[PDB]
Structure 1
Amino acid sequence: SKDFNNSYGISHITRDNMVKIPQQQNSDQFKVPAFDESTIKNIASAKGKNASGNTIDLDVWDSWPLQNADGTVATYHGYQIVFALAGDPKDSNDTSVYLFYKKAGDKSIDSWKNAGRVFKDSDKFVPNDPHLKNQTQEWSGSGTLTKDGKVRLFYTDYSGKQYGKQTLTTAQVNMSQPNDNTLKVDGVEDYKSIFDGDGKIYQTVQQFIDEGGWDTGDNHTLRDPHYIEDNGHKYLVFEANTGTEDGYQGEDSLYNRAYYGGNNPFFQSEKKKLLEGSNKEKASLANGALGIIELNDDYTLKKVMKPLITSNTVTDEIERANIFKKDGKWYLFTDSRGSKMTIDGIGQDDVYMLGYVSNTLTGKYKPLNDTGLVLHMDLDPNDKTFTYSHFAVPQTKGDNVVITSYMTNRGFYEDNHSTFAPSFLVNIDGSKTSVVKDRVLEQGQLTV
């Protein structure tokens, strides 16, 4: 037959793991806490310009804190820093990275000030770079406070004039303080593309173009770079899709036992069902990956490494890659949409954070809570307290991590702009996780 088994020396989000998320997810152990509608506030300082040029209240989406190397929230001249994607739906597509800041001691969302856009429109054209001048949008990433005490940003260069090309990009963000309660973005330097895919380990946009682009239903990704360090080495962990040599998309992927897990009877039943049902083509195209590249000390590409984990057959889209070390173990997280999944019992309303644990950085990642489920959110997108882009922020002590997310906040009354969601706690103990009951933090709170 066509049945085979190739793990490609890497870990896999398996169908056997995923089919067990239904019912399990109904436990309060995994459910995102209900939020109080009466106290939801817009980020007051979140004001800027649209594509038309006038000043508007912004919709704030994907956000990430400035971090130390280990992932804990950094302190910069007494401030905590948050980078967030923001824009105006009258531009719809247009999104840029903004720098928000607040004295670490303060707690209120009203304390978050706005330093404005990290980049000027003109910034992408300064450096001699293979990709930057083709940029149309700024997408997610990470931020690190270097040993030299510099603000080092990683983000995604999205190119709408190159078939949705995504390039992992870096820049040093030069800061100043005009007064003793203001942070100012002076400008940027060392602004450069790092990686746009190789083809064999991670899919390139050229492979996306050559297959027929948007029409195919394929979803090309190469984004959300997350910075970490291990043993003196610098890495980025990011959302991608596999390449030709590490379990590519296509019909034959449906015959690989490694993507299914479980026993042979499960492999046969699940595969038969997948081959005959409505999700055959969707599953064939699904080859999402959490990738890892090693960097040089100047943040240029050093080595393209094999993926930490892939989601062949399950989904093309495992987003907001996150990784940190806790209790000597490596915890790897991703957010995923049920709508993009090919799993029975998981549907359009379902939104997840999935999690995995390994003894080493590049070792075998085993599912948290046996299935990989950490968080489940299933509110209608039009509900005021819909949350998205859940992100685990490690803490300096304790078994708890702080989950940040954005709340789309599409209510009828004010306040109704996309904003920081109330933060909450997830307990991490070995391979077990649990939402901490009755502990909701302030909107956008990074630490306890």
Structure 2
Amino acid sequence: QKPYKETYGISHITRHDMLQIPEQQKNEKYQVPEFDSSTIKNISSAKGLDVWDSWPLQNADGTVANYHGYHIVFALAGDPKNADDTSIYMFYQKVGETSIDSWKNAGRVFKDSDKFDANDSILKDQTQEWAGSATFTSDGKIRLFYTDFSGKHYGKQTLTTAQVNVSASDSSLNINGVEDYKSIFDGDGKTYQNVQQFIDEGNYSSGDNHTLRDPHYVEDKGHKYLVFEANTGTEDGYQGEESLFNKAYYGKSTSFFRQESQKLLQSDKKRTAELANGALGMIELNDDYTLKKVMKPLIASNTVTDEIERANVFKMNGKWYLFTDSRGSKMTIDGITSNDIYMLGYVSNSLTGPYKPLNKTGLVLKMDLDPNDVTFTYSHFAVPQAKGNNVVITSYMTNRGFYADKQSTFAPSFLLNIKGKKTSVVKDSILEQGQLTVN
């Protein structure tokens, strides 16, 4: 077929941009820090469990929250030897502490008995509790969103939520039970990808990747949304051979494309490309947290890579930032090796409109450390603060399943300066093994 530049009304991750990221990502303003291991210890509260991808119960706008003189958190958490055992436990601390050991673990959020009591068709096939957000409601409640996926229906990722009825005490914090347990979204097909269309390619064999996870809860003018990791559906320009001919996914200029589109496909990977069709997405909710509108995705990684992960977004010092973590490993951009790993940033004047990379590449943070390294760190998450130009970068250290007395723990959070549309790792800011703040 011939050339077309169509941007579908939304922004995208041009490849051009993604092509400076091999030169620019060598500047240290943009580089996660070498951490010290003689420091890193594991989690008391957890108990030999591995613990990665985590979120903090936060407020309306971004900031961590005070649910009763208490800092709270939400991690994936598994039996190290089980690559299919995922579950959302709930660690939590006091609100004046920093120390890793300040983190009592409150137990698996959910009862095995739960998926059923729920009354959610899609929910009784759930076989793994993946990641999301956790707001904290104006009427003092705990509202959780997370990934409802199942390895039985081909890895269908679904949009799930629940309130976390729970009681607090001057010293501890237990979990009575949960309610308002329902699944919101499973993909709509024209705009995002539902597990049916991933099966039409054969499913996994096909080679293509299906993701619908990490709903970030936020709100602007009292409208409260969910922004996630996804894949372009079938109208918001979609994965295909066709795919590679739209100049919207190259950017820079025509004639640029003509080289790249050419290279390319003359690739060793025309394909890993045609199928890479990912996105950070949007949808609206009702105060009962039911889907209200499916909205246009906020961005697409069209051709670069089919799996943007751990999506974020929030207003800070007046403008809207938005993010994501992703594995260079799984992208098609020369000079971005399989050791590469990232968090990316886009900004806009308005939550829903139009996100131009930060740093001019939307590169904000790169990380390479060999996988065996004890200081590997994945999922870096940009936590907003009351004010200041810094936000706190969280992550989980050390890989799930590698060492045998070393376990998916919290790697030291740290700092990051952001102002305007430029960021910069703040030099020498390593805070505590999990600090969610600074105050």
Structure 1 stretches of 4+ with a deviation exceeding 6 A read: 410-414
Amino acid at match of 1:122: S
The aligned residue for residue 251 of structure 2 is: 261
Identity %: 77
* Aligned with 2:101 (options 106, 110, 117): 110
- Give, in angstroms, the shift of residue 91 of structure 1: 2.3
From 351, 372, 381, the equivalent of 2:371 is 381
Shift of 1:274: 1.1
For the residues of structure 2 that align with 1:39 and 1:339, how far apart are their CA atoms? 29
Using the TM superposition, give the Cα deviation of residue 438 of structure 1 relative to its aligned residue in structure 2, in angstroms: 1.0
Q: Is the partner of 1:88 in helix, strand or coil?
A: coil
- Is contact 1:383–1:410 with CA below 8 Å preserved after alignment? no
Secondary structure of the structure 2 residue equivalent to 1:437:
coil
1:201 corresponds to 2:191: yes
SS at match of 2:196: helix
1:126 counterpart residue number: 117
State how far apart, in whole Å, the 2-side matches of 1:366 and 1:306 are.
Answer: 16
Find the aligned partners of 2:417 and 2:174 in 1 and give their Cα distance: 36
In structure 2, stretches of 5+ residues that fail to align are: none
The CA deviation string for residues 296-349 of structure 1, in whole angstroms up to 9 with x for no partner, is 110000000010000110000100000000122110110010110000000111
Residue in 2 that maps onto 1:32: 32
Task: Say whether residues 1:10 and 2:10 are aligned partners.
Answer: yes
The equivalent of 1:310 in structure 2 is 300
Partners of 2:53 and 2:124 in 1: CA distance? 23
Residue equivalent to 1:176: 167
Q: How does 1:242-281 map to 2 (within 5 A)?
A: 242-281=232-271
Cross-structure match for 2:63: 72
More helix by share: 1
* Matched-pair contact (CA < 8 Å) for 1:384–1:411: no
Please name the residue that 1:50 is paired with.
none
Note if 1:223 corresponds to 2:216.
Answer: no
Find the aligned partners of 2:141 and 2:63 in 1 and give their Cα distance. Answer: 16
Report deviation, 1:413. Answer: 8.2
Deviation at 1:433, TM superposition (A): 0.3
Out of 136, 155, 161, the position equivalent to 2:146 is 155
Q: Tell me which residue corresponds to 1:52.
A: none
Q: What is the CA–CA distance in structure 2 between the aligned matches of 1:287 and 1:336, rounded to whole Å?
A: 13
Scaled by the length of structure 2, the TM-score of the pair is 0.98
How many residues matched? 438
Structure 1: state its 5+ residue gaps.
48-56
Letter in 1 for 2:68: H
**CA distance, structure 2, for counterparts of residue 199 and residue 422 of structure 1:** 40
Q: Is the CA contact (8 Å cut-off) linking 1:384 and 1:410 kept in structure 2?
A: no
Aligned CA-pair RMSD: 1.3
| 1-structure distance, mates of 2:315, 2:172 | 33
1:272-298 Cα shifts (integer Å, max 9, x gaps): 011101110001000000000000110
C-alpha displacement of 1:216: 0.9
Match of 1:339 in 2: 329
1:42 matched to 2:33? The reply is: no
Matched AA of 2:178 = V
**Residue equivalent to 2:393:** 403
Are 1:383 and 1:411, in contact at CA under 8 Å, matched by a contact in 2? Answer: no
Q: How much has 1:14 moved relative to structure 2?
A: 0.6
Residue 141 (structure 1) aligned with residue 132 (structure 2): yes
Structure 1: distance between partners of 2:107 and 2:310? 23
Match of 2:435 in 1: 445
Equivalent residue for 2:76, pick from 72, 85, 98: 85
Letter in 1 for 2:265: L
| Aligned residues of 1:141 and 1:155 also touching (Cα < 8 A) | yes
Counting strand residues as a fraction of each chain, which structure ranks higher? 1
State the alpha-carbon separation in 2 of the partners of residues 127 and 13 from structure 1: 39
CA drift at 1:90: 2.3
Residues 264 and 321 of structure 1: CA distance in aligned 2, closer, same or farther (over 3 Å): same
In 2, Cα distance between equivalents of 1:155 and 1:286: 23
Partners of 2:400 and 2:211 lie apart in 1 by 27
Aligned partners of 2:284 and 2:293 also within 8 Å: yes
Question: Is this contact kept in 1: 2:50–2:401, CA < 8 A?
Answer: no
C-alpha separation in 2, matches of 1:220 and 1:209 = 10
Distance (Å, rounded) in 1 between the aligned partners of 2:162 and 2:218: 16
Q: Matched residues in 2 for 1:6 and 1:342: separation?
A: 20
Shift, 1:127, TM fit:
2.0
Q: Report the residue type matching 1:381 in the other structure.
A: P
The answer on whether the counterparts of 1:289 and 1:307 sit within 8 Å (CA) in structure 2 is yes
Does structure 1 conserve the Cα–Cα contact (< 8 Å) formed by 2:4 and 2:247? yes
CA distance in 2, matches of 1:170, 1:270: 42
Confirm whether residue 211 of structure 1 aligns to residue 201 of structure 2: yes
The answer to whether the Cα contact below 8 Å between 2:328 and 2:336 also exists between their aligned partners in 1 is yes
Task: Measure, in 2, the Cα distance between the counterparts of 1:348 and 1:233.
Answer: 39
